Design a protein around this motif. Structure first.
Motif, PDB file in Angstrom:
ATOM      1  N   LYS A  93     -31.551  11.240  51.665  1.00  0.00           N
ATOM      2  CA  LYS A  93     -30.156  11.646  51.530  1.00  0.00           C
ATOM      3  C   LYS A  93     -29.220  10.450  51.677  1.00  0.00           C
ATOM      4  N   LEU A  94     -29.777   9.334  52.128  1.00  0.00           N
ATOM      5  CA  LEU A  94     -28.998   8.109  52.314  1.00  0.00           C
ATOM      6  C   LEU A  94     -28.488   7.617  50.967  1.00  0.00           C
ATOM      7  CD1 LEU A  94     -28.153   6.108  54.565  1.00  0.00           C
ATOM      8  CD2 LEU A  94     -30.283   4.869  54.166  1.00  0.00           C
ATOM      9  N   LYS A  95     -27.254   7.148  50.936  1.00  0.00           N
ATOM     10  CA  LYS A  95     -26.706   6.474  49.763  1.00  0.00           C
ATOM     11  C   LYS A  95     -26.333   5.032  50.118  1.00  0.00           C
ATOM     12  CE  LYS A  95     -24.690  10.905  49.760  1.00  0.00           C
ATOM     13  NZ  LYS A  95     -23.255  10.886  49.339  1.00  0.00           N
ATOM     14  N   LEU A  96     -26.500   4.113  49.174  1.00  0.00           N
ATOM     15  CA  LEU A  96     -26.248   2.695  49.450  1.00  0.00           C
ATOM     16  C   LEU A  96     -24.887   2.467  50.090  1.00  0.00           C
ATOM     17  CD1 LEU A  96     -27.330  -0.196  49.263  1.00  0.00           C
ATOM     18  CD2 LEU A  96     -26.387  -0.327  46.949  1.00  0.00           C
ATOM     19  N   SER A  97     -23.830   3.049  49.526  1.00  0.00           N
ATOM     20  CA  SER A  97     -22.489   2.819  50.071  1.00  0.00           C
ATOM     21  C   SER A  97     -22.316   3.422  51.457  1.00  0.00           C
ATOM     22  CB  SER A  97     -21.413   3.404  49.146  1.00  0.00           C
ATOM     23  OG  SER A  97     -21.151   2.556  48.044  1.00  0.00           O
ATOM     24  N   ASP A  98     -23.204   4.318  51.895  1.00  0.00           N
ATOM     25  CA  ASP A  98     -23.102   4.857  53.251  1.00  0.00           C
ATOM     26  C   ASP A  98     -23.212   3.744  54.300  1.00  0.00           C
ATOM     27  OD1 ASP A  98     -25.185   7.861  52.622  1.00  0.00           O
ATOM     28  OD2 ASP A  98     -23.060   7.608  52.201  1.00  0.00           O
ATOM     29  N   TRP A  99     -23.962   2.682  53.995  1.00  0.00           N
ATOM     30  CA  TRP A  99     -24.290   1.640  54.962  1.00  0.00           C
ATOM     31  C   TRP A  99     -24.071   0.207  54.480  1.00  0.00           C
ATOM     32  CZ3 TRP A  99     -27.962  -2.168  54.143  1.00  0.00           C
ATOM     33  CH2 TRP A  99     -28.796  -1.984  53.031  1.00  0.00           C
ATOM     34  N   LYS A 159     -29.907  -3.784  40.719  1.00  0.00           N
ATOM     35  CA  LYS A 159     -29.061  -3.019  41.618  1.00  0.00           C
ATOM     36  C   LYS A 159     -29.668  -2.867  43.015  1.00  0.00           C
ATOM     37  CE  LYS A 159     -27.123  -2.819  37.712  1.00  0.00           C
ATOM     38  NZ  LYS A 159     -28.290  -2.879  36.792  1.00  0.00           N
ATOM     39  N   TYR A 215     -29.216   7.839  61.407  1.00  0.00           N
ATOM     40  CA  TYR A 215     -29.963   8.485  60.325  1.00  0.00           C
ATOM     41  C   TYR A 215     -31.468   8.434  60.536  1.00  0.00           C
ATOM     42  CZ  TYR A 215     -31.959   8.968  55.570  1.00  0.00           C
ATOM     43  OH  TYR A 215     -32.709   9.333  54.464  1.00  0.00           O
ATOM     44  N   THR A 241     -37.038  -3.398  46.127  1.00  0.00           N
ATOM     45  CA  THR A 241     -35.882  -2.510  46.228  1.00  0.00           C
ATOM     46  C   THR A 241     -34.861  -3.027  47.252  1.00  0.00           C
ATOM     47  OG1 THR A 241     -36.853  -0.963  47.839  1.00  0.00           O
ATOM     48  CG2 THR A 241     -37.231  -0.459  45.540  1.00  0.00           C
TER      49      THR A 241
END
Ligand SMILES: CC(=O)N[C@@H]1[C@@H](O)[C@H](O[C@@H]2O[C@H](CO)[C@H](O)[C@H](O)[C@H]2O)[C@@H](CO)O[C@H]1O
Ligand SMILES: O=c1ccn([C@@H]2O[C@H](COP(=O)(O)OP(=O)(O)O)[C@@H](O)[C@H]2O)c(=O)[nH]1
Ligand SMILES: [Mn+2]
Length: 287
Positions: A1-7, A23, A40, A249
Protein backbone atom coordinates in the motif's frame (compact mmCIF):
# COMPACT_ATOMS: atom_id res chain seq x y z
CA UNK A 1 0.00 0.00 0.00
CA UNK A 2 3.10 2.19 0.26
CA UNK A 3 3.51 4.87 -2.40
CA UNK A 4 6.87 6.46 -3.29
CA UNK A 5 5.72 10.00 -2.47
CA UNK A 6 4.52 8.80 0.96
CA UNK A 7 8.19 8.66 2.07
CA UNK A 8 10.57 10.02 -0.68
CA UNK A 9 11.02 13.74 -1.56
CA UNK A 10 13.70 14.24 -4.24
CA UNK A 11 13.50 18.05 -4.13
CA UNK A 12 15.31 17.97 -0.79
CA UNK A 13 18.54 17.12 -2.68
CA UNK A 14 18.31 19.04 -5.94
CA UNK A 15 21.97 18.90 -6.87
CA UNK A 16 22.47 15.08 -7.02
CA UNK A 17 20.75 12.28 -8.98
CA UNK A 18 17.60 11.22 -7.08
CA UNK A 19 15.66 9.31 -9.75
CA UNK A 20 16.64 6.85 -12.50
CA UNK A 21 15.19 6.67 -16.03
CA UNK A 22 13.27 3.54 -14.99
CA UNK A 23 11.77 5.52 -12.06
CA UNK A 24 13.70 3.97 -9.15
CA UNK A 25 14.65 6.30 -6.28
CA UNK A 26 18.30 7.03 -5.37
CA UNK A 27 18.19 7.43 -1.56
CA UNK A 28 20.20 10.40 -0.26
CA UNK A 29 20.29 11.94 3.25
CA UNK A 30 17.41 14.44 3.39
CA UNK A 31 15.13 12.68 0.94
CA UNK A 32 13.59 10.04 3.24
CA UNK A 33 10.88 10.10 5.92
CA UNK A 34 11.99 7.34 8.31
CA UNK A 35 9.20 7.86 10.84
CA UNK A 36 6.54 7.19 8.19
CA UNK A 37 8.36 4.02 7.16
CA UNK A 38 9.06 2.71 10.67
CA UNK A 39 5.34 2.90 11.44
CA UNK A 40 4.38 1.17 8.18
CA UNK A 41 6.83 -1.72 8.54
CA UNK A 42 6.16 -2.19 12.24
CA UNK A 43 2.46 -2.77 11.54
CA UNK A 44 3.46 -5.49 9.12
CA UNK A 45 5.82 -6.90 11.75
CA UNK A 46 8.82 -7.41 9.44
CA UNK A 47 12.16 -9.12 10.21
CA UNK A 48 15.37 -8.17 8.31
CA UNK A 49 18.36 -10.47 7.71
CA UNK A 50 22.07 -9.67 7.15
CA UNK A 51 24.70 -12.12 5.80
CA UNK A 52 28.47 -11.57 6.42
CA UNK A 53 31.49 -13.80 5.60
CA UNK A 54 34.83 -13.84 7.36
CA UNK A 55 37.43 -16.40 6.22
CA UNK A 56 41.07 -16.42 7.40
CA UNK A 57 42.48 -13.34 9.15
CA UNK A 58 39.52 -11.24 8.04
CA UNK A 59 38.01 -12.73 11.22
CA UNK A 60 40.50 -11.10 13.66
CA UNK A 61 40.82 -7.88 11.64
CA UNK A 62 37.17 -7.00 10.89
CA UNK A 63 34.42 -9.26 12.28
CA UNK A 64 34.06 -7.80 15.79
CA UNK A 65 33.97 -4.19 14.58
CA UNK A 66 31.46 -5.06 11.84
CA UNK A 67 29.04 -6.85 14.24
CA UNK A 68 29.34 -4.32 17.12
CA UNK A 69 28.49 -1.49 14.69
CA UNK A 70 25.65 -3.46 13.02
CA UNK A 71 24.10 -4.10 16.46
CA UNK A 72 24.05 -0.33 17.13
CA UNK A 73 22.90 1.02 13.76
CA UNK A 74 21.19 -1.56 11.43
CA UNK A 75 17.32 -1.46 11.24
CA UNK A 76 16.96 -0.27 14.84
CA UNK A 77 13.41 -0.81 16.12
CA UNK A 78 12.78 -4.00 14.09
CA UNK A 79 13.79 -7.65 14.62
CA UNK A 80 17.11 -8.47 12.89
CA UNK A 81 18.97 -11.78 12.39
CA UNK A 82 22.75 -11.78 11.68
CA UNK A 83 23.97 -14.83 9.66
CA UNK A 84 27.73 -15.24 10.14
CA UNK A 85 29.74 -17.53 7.85
CA UNK A 86 33.30 -18.42 9.02
CA UNK A 87 35.90 -21.15 8.33
CA UNK A 88 36.85 -21.50 12.02
CA UNK A 89 34.06 -21.06 14.57
CA UNK A 90 36.54 -21.25 17.41
CA UNK A 91 37.77 -17.76 16.43
CA UNK A 92 34.36 -16.10 16.26
CA UNK A 93 33.98 -13.05 18.52
CA UNK A 94 30.85 -13.60 20.65
CA UNK A 95 29.76 -9.99 21.46
CA UNK A 96 26.74 -8.86 23.44
CA UNK A 97 23.69 -8.02 21.29
CA UNK A 98 20.94 -5.47 22.05
CA UNK A 99 17.12 -5.46 21.92
CA UNK A 100 15.65 -7.06 18.76
CA UNK A 101 18.98 -8.50 17.56
CA UNK A 102 19.91 -12.23 17.44
CA UNK A 103 22.30 -14.41 15.43
CA UNK A 104 23.49 -17.77 14.20
CA UNK A 105 26.85 -19.03 12.97
CA UNK A 106 27.80 -21.54 10.20
CA UNK A 107 31.13 -23.24 9.44
CA UNK A 108 32.11 -23.05 5.76
CA UNK A 109 35.02 -24.49 3.69
CA UNK A 110 37.87 -22.00 3.04
CA UNK A 111 38.62 -21.77 -0.70
CA UNK A 112 42.32 -21.73 -1.64
CA UNK A 113 42.38 -18.40 -3.52
CA UNK A 114 41.05 -15.16 -2.00
CA UNK A 115 39.36 -14.51 -5.38
CA UNK A 116 37.32 -17.72 -4.97
CA UNK A 117 36.51 -16.94 -1.32
CA UNK A 118 34.89 -13.69 -2.53
CA UNK A 119 33.08 -15.25 -5.53
CA UNK A 120 31.82 -18.43 -3.77
CA UNK A 121 29.69 -16.24 -1.46
CA UNK A 122 27.18 -16.11 -4.36
CA UNK A 123 26.72 -19.93 -4.25
CA UNK A 124 26.60 -20.15 -0.44
CA UNK A 125 24.05 -17.31 0.02
CA UNK A 126 21.60 -18.95 -2.41
CA UNK A 127 21.89 -22.32 -0.64
CA UNK A 128 21.07 -20.61 2.68
CA UNK A 129 18.11 -18.71 1.18
CA UNK A 130 16.49 -21.95 0.02
CA UNK A 131 17.23 -23.86 3.24
CA UNK A 132 16.14 -21.27 5.85
CA UNK A 133 16.43 -17.50 5.14
CA UNK A 134 13.33 -17.46 2.91
CA UNK A 135 11.32 -18.68 5.95
CA UNK A 136 12.86 -16.25 8.44
CA UNK A 137 12.90 -12.70 6.98
CA UNK A 138 11.02 -10.29 4.67
CA UNK A 139 14.20 -8.56 3.32
CA UNK A 140 17.90 -9.55 3.26
CA UNK A 141 21.17 -7.54 2.91
CA UNK A 142 24.45 -9.23 1.90
CA UNK A 143 27.59 -7.31 2.99
CA UNK A 144 31.40 -7.32 2.99
CA UNK A 145 33.02 -7.58 6.45
CA UNK A 146 35.78 -4.94 5.83
CA UNK A 147 33.60 -1.91 6.68
CA UNK A 148 31.95 -0.28 9.76
CA UNK A 149 28.46 1.19 10.37
CA UNK A 150 28.69 4.89 11.42
CA UNK A 151 25.04 6.02 11.75
CA UNK A 152 21.45 4.77 11.28
CA UNK A 153 21.06 2.35 8.31
CA UNK A 154 17.29 1.94 8.42
CA UNK A 155 14.08 0.89 6.68
CA UNK A 156 14.48 3.69 4.08
CA UNK A 157 16.92 1.21 2.40
CA UNK A 158 14.42 -1.69 1.97
CA UNK A 159 13.03 -2.76 -1.42
CA UNK A 160 12.52 -5.66 -3.92
CA UNK A 161 16.09 -5.31 -5.28
CA UNK A 162 18.62 -2.87 -3.79
CA UNK A 163 21.99 -1.71 -5.21
CA UNK A 164 24.80 0.50 -3.81
CA UNK A 165 26.63 3.25 -5.75
CA UNK A 166 30.42 2.81 -5.49
CA UNK A 167 31.93 5.88 -3.80
CA UNK A 168 34.76 6.64 -6.28
CA UNK A 169 32.59 6.49 -9.42
CA UNK A 170 29.10 7.99 -8.74
CA UNK A 171 29.74 11.22 -10.74
CA UNK A 172 31.67 9.49 -13.58
CA UNK A 173 30.53 8.71 -17.17
CA UNK A 174 29.82 5.02 -17.92
CA UNK A 175 32.66 4.74 -20.46
CA UNK A 176 35.05 5.41 -17.58
CA UNK A 177 33.60 2.64 -15.35
CA UNK A 178 35.77 -0.38 -14.54
CA UNK A 179 33.29 -2.90 -16.00
CA UNK A 180 34.64 -6.16 -17.48
CA UNK A 181 35.44 -5.20 -21.11
CA UNK A 182 36.46 -8.59 -22.66
CA UNK A 183 33.67 -10.11 -24.75
CA UNK A 184 34.78 -13.64 -23.76
CA UNK A 185 33.52 -13.11 -20.16
CA UNK A 186 29.91 -13.64 -19.02
CA UNK A 187 30.32 -10.29 -17.20
CA UNK A 188 31.08 -8.26 -20.38
CA UNK A 189 29.53 -4.79 -20.74
CA UNK A 190 30.31 -3.04 -24.07
CA UNK A 191 31.44 0.56 -24.29
CA UNK A 192 28.36 2.65 -24.88
CA UNK A 193 26.25 0.74 -22.33
CA UNK A 194 25.64 0.98 -18.57
CA UNK A 195 23.68 3.10 -16.06
CA UNK A 196 25.84 3.19 -12.91
CA UNK A 197 28.83 1.45 -11.30
CA UNK A 198 27.51 -0.64 -8.39
CA UNK A 199 29.61 -1.80 -5.39
CA UNK A 200 29.48 -5.52 -4.47
CA UNK A 201 30.12 -4.62 -0.79
CA UNK A 202 26.35 -4.05 -0.22
CA UNK A 203 23.33 -5.52 -2.09
CA UNK A 204 19.90 -6.76 -0.99
CA UNK A 205 16.21 -7.32 -1.60
CA UNK A 206 13.45 -9.81 -0.83
CA UNK A 207 14.73 -13.41 -0.41
CA UNK A 208 13.23 -14.24 -3.80
CA UNK A 209 15.11 -11.45 -5.55
CA UNK A 210 18.44 -12.02 -3.80
CA UNK A 211 18.18 -15.71 -4.76
CA UNK A 212 17.93 -14.63 -8.41
CA UNK A 213 20.84 -12.12 -8.08
CA UNK A 214 23.16 -14.72 -6.50
CA UNK A 215 22.14 -17.65 -8.75
CA UNK A 216 22.69 -15.64 -11.97
CA UNK A 217 26.03 -14.21 -10.80
CA UNK A 218 27.30 -17.69 -9.81
CA UNK A 219 26.25 -19.11 -13.20
CA UNK A 220 28.44 -16.44 -14.83
CA UNK A 221 31.39 -17.19 -12.52
CA UNK A 222 31.14 -20.90 -13.47
CA UNK A 223 30.88 -20.24 -17.22
CA UNK A 224 34.01 -18.06 -17.12
CA UNK A 225 35.92 -20.93 -15.42
CA UNK A 226 35.04 -23.24 -18.33
CA UNK A 227 36.29 -20.56 -20.78
CA UNK A 228 39.57 -20.03 -18.86
CA UNK A 229 38.84 -16.39 -18.03
CA UNK A 230 38.40 -14.51 -14.69
CA UNK A 231 36.53 -11.18 -14.54
CA UNK A 232 38.58 -8.09 -13.62
CA UNK A 233 36.69 -7.34 -10.39
CA UNK A 234 35.42 -10.88 -9.73
CA UNK A 235 31.89 -11.07 -8.25
CA UNK A 236 31.47 -7.24 -8.61
CA UNK A 237 31.91 -7.49 -12.41
CA UNK A 238 29.12 -10.11 -12.57
CA UNK A 239 26.88 -8.08 -10.20
CA UNK A 240 27.17 -5.03 -12.51
CA UNK A 241 26.14 -7.19 -15.52
CA UNK A 242 23.19 -8.54 -13.55
CA UNK A 243 21.91 -5.05 -12.56
CA UNK A 244 22.28 -3.81 -16.17
CA UNK A 245 19.91 -6.57 -17.35
CA UNK A 246 17.63 -6.59 -14.27
CA UNK A 247 17.45 -2.98 -13.07
CA UNK A 248 17.36 -2.44 -9.28
CA UNK A 249 14.13 -1.12 -7.77
CA UNK A 250 16.13 1.07 -5.28
CA UNK A 251 19.68 2.51 -5.23
CA UNK A 252 21.62 3.81 -2.17
CA UNK A 253 23.79 6.97 -2.37
CA UNK A 254 27.51 6.75 -1.55
CA UNK A 255 26.62 8.13 1.95
CA UNK A 256 25.61 4.48 2.61
CA UNK A 257 29.13 3.12 1.78
CA UNK A 258 31.77 5.88 1.88
CA UNK A 259 35.59 5.78 1.50
CA UNK A 260 37.14 8.50 3.74
CA UNK A 261 40.37 8.22 1.70
CA UNK A 262 38.48 10.44 -0.80
CA UNK A 263 37.91 13.13 1.82
CA UNK A 264 34.43 14.47 2.72
CA UNK A 265 33.01 16.61 -0.08
CA UNK A 266 29.80 18.66 -0.02
CA UNK A 267 27.52 15.94 -1.46
CA UNK A 268 28.17 13.50 1.41
CA UNK A 269 26.00 14.87 4.22
CA UNK A 270 25.77 12.07 6.86
CA UNK A 271 27.84 8.85 6.48
CA UNK A 272 26.01 5.63 7.42
CA UNK A 273 28.88 3.18 6.67
CA UNK A 274 32.65 3.56 5.97
CA UNK A 275 35.30 1.38 4.29
CA UNK A 276 38.15 -0.10 6.36
CA UNK A 277 41.70 0.67 5.16
CA UNK A 278 42.99 -2.16 2.95
CA UNK A 279 45.54 -4.53 4.58
CA UNK A 280 46.08 -7.09 1.85
CA UNK A 281 49.68 -7.98 2.91
CA UNK A 282 48.25 -9.54 6.08
CA UNK A 283 44.71 -10.71 5.34
CA UNK A 284 45.28 -12.29 1.90
CA UNK A 285 47.64 -15.24 1.34
CA UNK A 286 47.84 -15.41 -2.43
CA UNK A 287 48.42 -12.84 -5.17
C1 LIG B 1 39.11 6.80 -9.48
C2 LIG B 1 39.83 5.53 -8.98
O1 LIG B 1 40.61 4.94 -9.71
N1 LIG B 1 39.56 5.08 -7.74
C3 LIG B 1 40.10 3.80 -7.18
C4 LIG B 1 38.97 2.92 -6.58
O2 LIG B 1 38.19 2.41 -7.68
C5 LIG B 1 39.59 1.80 -5.74
O3 LIG B 1 38.54 1.01 -5.09
C6 LIG B 1 38.35 -0.32 -5.59
O4 LIG B 1 37.55 -0.20 -6.81
C7 LIG B 1 37.24 -1.52 -7.42
C8 LIG B 1 36.58 -1.26 -8.76
O5 LIG B 1 37.38 -0.40 -9.58
C9 LIG B 1 36.50 -2.30 -6.41
O6 LIG B 1 35.20 -1.72 -6.17
C10 LIG B 1 37.30 -2.49 -5.10
O7 LIG B 1 36.58 -3.22 -4.10
C11 LIG B 1 37.65 -1.11 -4.53
O8 LIG B 1 38.49 -1.30 -3.37
C12 LIG B 1 40.49 2.36 -4.62
C13 LIG B 1 41.21 1.35 -3.75
O9 LIG B 1 41.88 2.01 -2.66
O10 LIG B 1 41.53 3.18 -5.25
C14 LIG B 1 41.01 4.30 -6.03
O11 LIG B 1 42.10 5.05 -6.50
O1 LIG C 1 40.38 -14.07 2.16
C1 LIG C 1 39.22 -13.70 2.02
C2 LIG C 1 38.81 -12.79 0.99
C3 LIG C 1 37.42 -12.27 1.04
N1 LIG C 1 36.64 -12.41 2.21
C4 LIG C 1 35.22 -11.94 2.27
O2 LIG C 1 34.81 -11.43 0.98
C5 LIG C 1 34.68 -9.97 1.03
C6 LIG C 1 35.21 -9.36 -0.30
O3 LIG C 1 36.64 -9.24 -0.25
P1 LIG C 1 37.38 -7.87 0.02
O4 LIG C 1 36.53 -7.09 0.97
O5 LIG C 1 38.80 -8.18 0.42
O6 LIG C 1 37.37 -7.13 -1.42
P2 LIG C 1 37.62 -5.53 -1.66
O7 LIG C 1 36.35 -4.79 -1.13
O8 LIG C 1 38.84 -5.15 -0.85
O9 LIG C 1 37.71 -5.41 -3.15
C7 LIG C 1 35.43 -9.59 2.33
O10 LIG C 1 34.93 -8.36 2.91
C8 LIG C 1 35.04 -10.75 3.25
O11 LIG C 1 33.71 -10.68 3.78
C9 LIG C 1 37.14 -13.11 3.32
O12 LIG C 1 36.41 -13.36 4.28
N2 LIG C 1 38.40 -13.71 3.20
MN1 LIG D 1 35.46 -5.12 0.82
Amino acid sequence: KLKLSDWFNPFKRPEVVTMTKWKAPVVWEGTYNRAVLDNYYAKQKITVGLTVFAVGRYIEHYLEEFLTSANKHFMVGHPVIFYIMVDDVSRMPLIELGPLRSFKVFKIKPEKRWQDISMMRMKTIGEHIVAHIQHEVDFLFCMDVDQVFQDKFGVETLGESVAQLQAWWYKADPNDFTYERRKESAAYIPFGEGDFYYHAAIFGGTPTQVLNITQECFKGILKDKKNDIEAQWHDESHLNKYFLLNKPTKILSPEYCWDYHIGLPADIKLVKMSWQTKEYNVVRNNV
